[PDB]
């Protein structure tokens, strides 16, 4: 339509989304993630105070 | 979209171009892309049993069902259907149509 | 929008029997772009060619206007609110008359920073923002200067640290703070006090440095301060480089109308996440 | 899609992050222990009493946190009472958990008084824990900072033509020569502090984080994440905690 | 032209007490261009 | 926790301009003769 270019009636638009998702969430685990493991078999363990 | 309305007379003036038209997002909505389904629930004794003409009943019924779904698809595309899904596209300024 | 909550207890009895999950997917946010014209109209000691001079002057003026607007409290207002697409309707009564022109207004800084209201077209400067479901954090709060009996309009000594705490809880990582020179005296005097616990020293020094350009909350978050005269006096901002981006559609073009000189710059504002940046209004409660 | 990649790997990473956050909160919280096994013939006679024979519900399953008394005073039913001073260890005599009052400060400024830290350190010293670490949530570090501000003039900061200002404190030295470092965690009850110890106090996992799934009923994309971690302390009278001043 | 979503494929879902289930799950759709481009002619005895 | 990563759908695609054309392009004179142009506004011929 070379006569006049109009914008409000523009059909078949392109939403122009963003290829990224800000998933910011607090998850640091400073020390508790760096303690270790003592894998066991049962679920009734103890430590003999 | 629209192409033209009328041809009629082409005489013009140097200022007879006031205005004509309006704007609203396109009315082309969507297609829902219907789905088909064919299943069997053969047992084990059935698949293990034998019979004349065919072997494992399971594969026989499975192939029959494949042919049947092919026929169903071929017929559906020719019948009268109209889409009325509840997932109205409605893009474009109130896009993504997720208020429901 | 956010990550899923913690839900606390998540014990089980050897069985799922779920409810199609509680995903509750993200929300879709958008913004609009506006137009700036700054027309030029020409109808001679040293100026000579005044055209280029006025053109550069108007360019600087439009840049200043952009810097003033993008940090305002405007709120995007247009016929479309959440159904931006409306490709079916999309203002059907537009073609044929072409005189239904509405005014494109973009979203401002204080509007995208997890606001809690707006006075029609401006963000309300007396209402704190809501809390994000991920972790309880109020990134927009009404300042409460508990030092004076609501007489002086100034930041409390521990009102920015509250913002740092909230941001750390929400995980913004911002490290910049813009401020209007009508408030730097507060941070300047913050290095001193009357109780006698904070005081400067000069060990045979020919200097009187009276300035602050860095802060570190007890949480270990550094914050660099910068001054900008184009901000509203009754507000302070907590910026961050990557969390804010400037979207542009039409670059500044020197041209003329249909068959004078003019400029036209289409620009919009984008913000990665509302609960990342922080704003703080300065006033007394009432 | 336009911003999403897939609906399974994305959601799977989501659930993994969520399960990690859940574990982090559960370990450092008041997750009272609730078990049904009141075993009496233990100590090298491992058997389940006649009860719990054929039934397969087994609802109650929790661990840790006070109920898991952990050297606390007392809890009120299914909720941990953050108002009960711990007992006295007969070894030397020391309470590792107490509740200071908010009378030295206004009746609305919930927090410590700068003296409870040293009291806790002395209690630990008498107990012989040798703890040197602190896990504290926000809204309480400002106390660690302004301890040298809410005074009469005795303590004071200094700024020698320096444009920097600082209210950060990540270490203190007890008068007993015990150095303590501060570390901020966000999954706390925002009303207490933990004088926990180093990695010596470790956990143990029975079923590591692993994926499973059922095949199909008519159609679905089911998946599972069923980690079975558990916690463990060591000589509960060693470490200690300090609740904040609320009143009663 | 058609609008096959992924494909027509056969696969089994979780079984049962000596059952055997199978599914196809074929998903397609049509696409006409210029609705005013294909002719239709019904047959009627009258109106 | 709870990573699914199946709902990105960040397509953010634009329109493609799939409109239809109805342009007849016979052009008999332009194809056979060439180009011819008058100068004045009125033209006449003799018979």
Brief rundown of the structure:
The structure is cut from a larger assembly and holds 6 copies of chain A. Chain A is low in regular secondary structure and 49 residues long. Chain A contains no helices and no strands.
Report on this model:
This is part of a larger assembly, with six copies of chain A. With 49 residues, chain A is mostly loops. The first copy, chain A, is 0% helix and 0% strand. Chain A has no helices and no strands. In chain A, 2% of the residues are buried. Chains C and D meet through helix 3, strand 5 and strand 6 of C and helix 1, helix 3, strand 4 and strand 5 of D. Chain C: This is Major head protein.
For the largest beta-sheet of chain A, the strand count, sense and barrel status come to: none
**Strand portion of chain A, in percent?**
under 5%
Computed structural class of chain A: little secondary structure
How far apart are the first and last residues' alpha carbons of chain A, in Å? 87 Å
Helix proportion range of chain A: under 10%
- What is the tally of beta strands of chain A? 0
Overall 3D form of chain A? rod-shaped
Tell me which oligomeric state these chains represent: part of a larger assembly
Summarize the largest interface: chains and residue counts. C-D, 46 and 50 residues
Rounded to the nearest angstrom, the radius of gyration of chain A is: 30 Å
Number of helical elements of chain A: 0
Protein name (chain A): Major head protein
């Amino acid at each position: 339509n070379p006569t006049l270019f109009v914008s409000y009636d523009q059909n078949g638009k392109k939403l122009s989304f963003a290829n990224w998702i800000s998933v910011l969430s607090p998850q640091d685990t400073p020390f508790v993630s760096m303690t270790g493991k003592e894998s066991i078999n049962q679920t009734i363990f103890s430590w003999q105070t | 979209d629209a192409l033209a309305s009328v041809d009629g007379n082409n005489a013009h003036v140097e200022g007879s171009r006031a205005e004509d038209g309006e704007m609203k997002p396109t009315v082309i909505k969507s297609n829902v892309t219907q789905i088909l389904r064919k299943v069997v629930r053969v047992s084990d004794t059935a698949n293990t049993t034998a019979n004349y003409g065919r072997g494992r009943e399971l594969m026989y019924q499975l192939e029959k069902k494949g042919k049947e779904i092919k026929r169903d698809l071929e017929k559906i595309l020719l019948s009268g259907q109209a889409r009325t899904d509840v997932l109205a596209d409605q893009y474009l300024t109130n896009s993504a149509a997720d208020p429901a | 929008d956010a990550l899923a909550s913690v839900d606390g207890n998540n014990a089980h009895v050897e069985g799922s029997r779920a409810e199609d999950g509680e995903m509750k997917p993200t929300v879709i946010k958008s913004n609009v772009t506006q137009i700036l014209r700054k027309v030029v109209r020409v109808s001679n000691y040293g100026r000579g060619r005044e055209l280029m001079y006025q053109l550069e002057k108007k360019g600087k003026e439009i840049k200043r206007d952009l810097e003033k607007i993008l940090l305002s409290g405007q709120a995007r207002t247009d016929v479309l609110a959440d159904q931006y697409l409306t490709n079916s309707a999309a203002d059907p009564a537009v073609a044929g008359l072409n005189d239904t022109h509405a005014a494109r207004k973009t979203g401002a800084f204080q509007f995208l920073c997890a606001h809690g209201g707006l006075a029609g077209g401006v963000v309300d400067k007396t209402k704190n923002g809501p809390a994000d479901p991920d972790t309880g954090a109020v990134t927009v709060k009404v300042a409460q200067n508990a030092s004076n009996p609501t007489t002086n309009i100034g930041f409390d000594e521990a009102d920015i640290f509250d913002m740092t705490l909230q941001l750390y809880t929400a995980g913004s990582e911002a490290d910049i703070i813009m401020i209007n020179p009508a408030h730097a005296k507060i941070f300047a005097g913050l290095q001193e006090n009357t109780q006698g616990s904070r005081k400067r020293i000069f060990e045979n020094t020919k200097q009187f440095i009276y300035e602050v350009n860095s802060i570190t909350d007890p949480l270990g978050q550094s914050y660099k301060i910068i001054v900008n005269r184009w901000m509203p006096t009754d507000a302070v901002y907590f910026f961050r480089s990557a969390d804010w981006t400037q979207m542009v559609l039409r670059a500044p073009k020197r041209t003329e109308l249909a068959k004078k000189w003019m400029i036209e710059m289409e620009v919009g504002l984008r913000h990665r996440n509302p609960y990342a940046s922080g704003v703080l209004f300065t006033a007394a409660g009432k | 899609n336009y911003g999403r990649g897939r609906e399974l790997m994305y959601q799977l990473e989501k659930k993994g992050k969520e399960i990690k956050r859940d574990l982090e909160k559960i370990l450092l919280s008041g997750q009272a222990r609730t078990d049904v096994l009141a075993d009496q013939y233990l100590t090298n006679s491992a058997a389940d009493p006649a009860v719990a024979g054929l039934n397969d519900t087994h609802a109650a399953r929790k661990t840790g946190a006070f109920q898991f008394l952990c050297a606390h005073g007392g809890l009120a039913g299914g909720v941990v009472d953050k108002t009960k001073n711990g007992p006295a260890d007969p070894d030397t005599g020391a309470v590792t958990v107490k509740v200071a009052q908010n009378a030295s400060n206004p009746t609305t400024n919930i927090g410590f008084d700068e003296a409870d830290i040293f009291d806790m350190t002395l209690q630990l010293y008498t107990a012989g824990s040798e703890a040197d670490i602190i896990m504290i949530n926000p809204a309480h570090a400002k106390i660690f900072a302004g301890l040298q501000e809410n005074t009469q003039g005795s303590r004071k900061r200094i700024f020698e033509n320096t444009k920097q200002f600082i209210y950060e404190v990540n270490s203190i030295t007890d008068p007993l020569g015990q150095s303590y470092k501060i570390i901020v965690n966000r999954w706390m009850p925002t009303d207490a502090v933990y004088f926990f110890r180093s990695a010596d106090w470790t956990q143990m996992v029975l079923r590591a984080p692993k994926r499973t799934e059922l095949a199909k009923d008519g159609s679905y994309e089911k998946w599972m994440i069923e980690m079975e971690v558990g916690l463990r302390h060591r000589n509960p009278y060693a470490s200690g905690v300090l609740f904040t001043a609320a009143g009663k």
